[PDB]
Design a protein around this nucleic acid. Sequence first.
DNA 1: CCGGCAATCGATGTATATATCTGACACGTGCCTGGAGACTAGGGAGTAATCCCCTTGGCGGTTAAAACGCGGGGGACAGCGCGTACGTGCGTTTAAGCGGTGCTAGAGCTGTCTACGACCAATTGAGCGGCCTCGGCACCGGGATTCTGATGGGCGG
DNA 2: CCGCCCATCAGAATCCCGGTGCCGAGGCCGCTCAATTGGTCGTAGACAGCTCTAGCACCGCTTAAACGCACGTACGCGCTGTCCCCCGCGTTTTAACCGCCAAGGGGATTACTCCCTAGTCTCCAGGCACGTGTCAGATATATACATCGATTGCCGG
Lengths: 135, 329, 110, 109, 98, 96, 97, 83, 83
Amino acid sequence: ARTKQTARKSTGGKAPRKQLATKAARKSAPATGGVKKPHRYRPGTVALREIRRYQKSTELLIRKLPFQRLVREIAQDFKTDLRFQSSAVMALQEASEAYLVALFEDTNLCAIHAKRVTIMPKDIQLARRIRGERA
Amino acid sequence: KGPVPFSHCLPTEKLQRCEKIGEGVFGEVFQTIADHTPVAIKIIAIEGPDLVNGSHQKTFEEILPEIIISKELSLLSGEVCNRTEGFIGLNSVHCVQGSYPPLLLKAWDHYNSTKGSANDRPDFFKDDQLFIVLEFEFGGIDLEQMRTKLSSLATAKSILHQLTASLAVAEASLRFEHRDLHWGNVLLKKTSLKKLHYTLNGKSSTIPSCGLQVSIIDYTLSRLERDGIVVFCDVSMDEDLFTGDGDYQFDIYRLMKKENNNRWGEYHPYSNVLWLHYLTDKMLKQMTFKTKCNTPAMKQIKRKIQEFHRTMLNFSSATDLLCQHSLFK
Amino acid sequence: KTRAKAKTRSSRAGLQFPVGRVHRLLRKGNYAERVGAGAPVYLAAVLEYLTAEILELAGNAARDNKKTRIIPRHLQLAVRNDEELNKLLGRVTIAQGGVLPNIQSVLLPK
Amino acid sequence: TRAKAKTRSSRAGLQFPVGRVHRLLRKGNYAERVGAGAPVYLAAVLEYLTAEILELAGNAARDNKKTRIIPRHLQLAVRNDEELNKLLGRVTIAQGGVLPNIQSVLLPK
Amino acid sequence: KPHRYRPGTVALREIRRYQKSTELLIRKLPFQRLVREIAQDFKTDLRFQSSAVMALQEASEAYLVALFEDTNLCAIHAKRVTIMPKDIQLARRIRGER
Amino acid sequence: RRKTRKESYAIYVYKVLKQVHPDTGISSKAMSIMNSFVNDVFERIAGEASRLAHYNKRSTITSREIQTAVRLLLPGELAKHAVSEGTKAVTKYTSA
Amino acid sequence: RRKTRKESYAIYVYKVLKQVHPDTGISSKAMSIMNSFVNDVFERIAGEASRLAHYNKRSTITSREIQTAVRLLLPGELAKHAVSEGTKAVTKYTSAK
Amino acid sequence: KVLRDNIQGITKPAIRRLARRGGVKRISGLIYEETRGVLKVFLENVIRDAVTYTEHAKRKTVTAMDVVYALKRQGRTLYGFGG
Amino acid sequence: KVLRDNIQGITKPAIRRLARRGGVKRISGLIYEETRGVLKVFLENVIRDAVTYTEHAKRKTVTAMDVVYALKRQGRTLYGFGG
DNA sequence: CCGGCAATCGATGTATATATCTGACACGTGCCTGGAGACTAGGGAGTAATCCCCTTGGCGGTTAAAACGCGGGGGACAGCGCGTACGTGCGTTTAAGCGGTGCTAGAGCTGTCTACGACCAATTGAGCGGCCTCGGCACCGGGATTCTGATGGGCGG
DNA sequence: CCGCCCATCAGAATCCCGGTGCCGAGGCCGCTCAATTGGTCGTAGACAGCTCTAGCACCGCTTAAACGCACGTACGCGCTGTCCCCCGCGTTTTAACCGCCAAGGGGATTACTCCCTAGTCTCCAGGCACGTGTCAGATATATACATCGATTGCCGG
């Protein structure tokens, strides 16, 4: 703001000399693909990577708008022309997520007990029956 | 007297304590401590045959109006009909003969090393070169460097109110047009006073301070009138000023020229109004604030500033805007 | 005359939690017709002890992660890794807590 | 000349005591005050539930060629009805037994 | 040739027989001795009423019968007809109790 | 020296039983069971009503609290019939 | 000051935290969680004590009821420390009254 | 304005993510419908209790406090939402 | 009069009878030790709570009301023995 | 000319019919304590008016996630064979159960009387609600480093 | 002649810095009202004494259940083969998310009645403890009757 605009003589590339003078190039592996072989991880590896990834974070795993629409649709059965605060829907979502995660843990234990690796509906049924939720 | 040596005006104690603060077409700006007070020194090379920094040297009979308006705006802080401390006071202005001492040369070298400069090295001047030195109070840091340092919108409102009050007082008292309020030209200083007092035509009022005090500088292209005589510089022949682009500030000169039909000698206070516009534009676009706008009261005042920005173009002068617009009521 | 200044009951008991407020809450909660003069002190001491225990464990967990503020993840980690506190809050859900990293041995690659 | 007293159960047309329930509500540390219509409601609800259970148990007892109800019949009545079984889901009845039930795979071929 | 039943007949007869009566299946004196020995650790020189021991026995037997039903369900889930300790452990783990 | 009297619900349970099945008796253990049942249900409903009253910053227990607690505690059916019985009893009482 | 005032346990929790870990902070969500925890435990202990007093045909709540409720509610190795702390506090209060 | 068929908005990848957080490696092809059904049952119970609480207070808006009270009544306490 | 080695009084036929009422057809040989352990743990918990109630009441005899209160506290309400 | 399917034939355990004998259940009586009638004082709850915050609904841009198709590797599931652990039954040993006899520790009740908790009036300082600043924490981007999985090339009894 | 090991290669995962954007501590005022201080006063419970119920200990005799051993077969477990069906990866299509903006519905606060509940005194009827018979259920004996396991007896490829 000297009353006129010029080029960039005011600053002698201060930001570059302070940082990224020439370091702004390439990083990590530079060569990728370029092979006839179709690079592929064997089945079961990315599954374990996802297991390790999602057991470390804390954020919600369901899109908010579909859940809110479902909640309103369910609630309209008991009374018409209802209203909600935001924190009410947030609390409902948190409780639902926690319940489902615990149920899946129990289901996995039941599946392993039968000498398998895949979970089937019968495992969910047995878990809910023993838990006392279903008679 | 006259072109006294630099040593008389700059003792070795002040010479060693000079810190480079700025550069420009006019010259150089340093900071030192004198009389147990931080003071700024502006140094300009005058009455020379050489060309420096892309322009020829400036004479004395055109720099006289600059010092005249500077002393007028400094002394208006003592008048009883209209009082305001929005300007900088005059300490001393004097003439020097000699060359540039190496201390300020190495200070300039350090300034280039840290920040960089847009001019040349001032080491070509001999003994016979003539210089002018102006002494001013310390004002603080420019708004440009304080962009990520403002607190919230309340500080913004206080700054705008102070600027408007100062400009209104100037117009009402001395019919002033300064016409170069770019955001690198206002200064912010920390203060402890809770309120600021201003007098216009005998009526006094107070403004919240919010922990800051604003000031204006660099009156090199200003216009004023006194007792039927006008002081200004005619700049109607250099169009490079109006060739700018890349910012609406570059367009404000063209818009003002359109408003006044390329006649600089006329008094049109409305020009200053659009200058506020540009600052307000900056205050809404190029600032980062520490505090979010979660408070409803701050939402209300933000809406107030938005409406002020979108509707203040319809007012006549600074006084009308101050005494009519709902923002300050 | 002079009533000899004042002194909160927390100061005489050496606690940090309020004693008067606990008394007022016990009186207005419909627990019994009359309330003794020593019950609020006991209750305040117990609550302060439990708070200090949980906070210390959470702070250790937060420091381990190289952060200087406690967030709900650290509270969940502190609670679930201590047997006694885990048994105390056995039917409680903490928002934004997550789970404990744990994978069965059968599912691991050979 | 006080009029001859008329108990509150008679006015409500019930079989359960209303004054006793009022006293129990008052001297129980539930609230500061107790309204005049609460005991009637509570007594009616309790009588209804008792009548339901008793009728089912008496049917079960008659099915066994008896004329007196014992805990076995109460268990048979409670465990064979969905709503009562849901209500008393965490309750043990002494000397009740269990319901006859064998998994189908265990049966001989 | 002496008469002999095939393995499984008498088991089904006993299943039908014990699901129709409503008695206690544990002898009383050993249970009383066990209760006193267990309580010996918390306080010395205690006395019990008769109804206290009776209530304890009733609750214990109800608990054991329910646990055995859950164990049978778990064992059948894995294509077996014999119950093994792993079934008890899985049932207790899922039910919530340690 | 006197033996303190103890109160129970046997009289009313016997009255209701003679009302429903007019030719059926009962034993002592069954009477104890029904006594415990009535006590348990009373405690559940009263506690829920008290909590409901405290939630809204009110100082009295009315029939609205009892009705809401009944609707909250009882399963799907057994909740309409109980509500109808209570409303009928209250209206009959207040009419007389 | 227009809104009616609301009370919480934030100040005392912050004092305890700054006493245990002198150079650590806390966020608002953690503050809410701590507040809920304190209220829940208070409610549990008070309800147990009231039931104990009612069982014994008393009409007053004393420190014996609180002590027995603490023994009944908390698991082992947590009951003992809480009992010790409460006894110390009561003795100090009584002596200096 | 009547909503219809919104349970289909609980996608398949979302169920997969929940299972992954649970620690599951292989998922069959008939699990998604079961998950949708059990979620519907859970939500029905909780929302019915919350709406009862809201109605009693002669109010027309469901707040977080009703949800917290209903969850506590079912036996699943929740910390952190105005508890 | 110290008592020792009484868990062996829960004989094998008694466990067989309980299993038969449970609906079990075939049994292993290692089940009895597990059953004895779980029974011991259950009894320990209940008796500890009952004795705490008795000690608060300032008595030396354990009554049926203490057992009933302990069972109700643990969430296993029992009907029939008073209360 | 057998491997089968049905039809007997014997033996064992459970359900059913009739006669005697008891103790637990169904009433009758007397008494006293807890509920009903009658009346007053005051404060909690209902109703109207008003303010303003938060919930619903709309529009446009972008882009991250959901939907779809296909090849193929690894797991679910059936069939088979073998060995031993568990069920059924008999002869012998042990301790539970029942019926009395005797002792006293401790639960349960009553009467006296003091000390601790409720209630009130005057005084005052803790704690919460508005407005405001600001130092550093968390976050992102890039670049480098590491670590791990999937591969071919080999010596050998 | 079946291999079972090692050295390379590429792709995620994790570290190091530099710049940005906001949050969580605090500072002030201003009240509001709830906690502290100093009294009086009525009753809950601590304490001491007494009565008598029921819990504990021991002994003798019967009979049913627990225990040990022999024998055989059906169930559990390991191994092989086959085929379907989920996983990993690239391409195309849908709608969630972000930012901003009006409109007004319903929750929250203030003031004013006024009817409903607690509290007190008097009186008598409902409900509890105690004592007697008689009859529903328990016990004993005999008698079918349904079902399990082995043997006979022909029978079509």
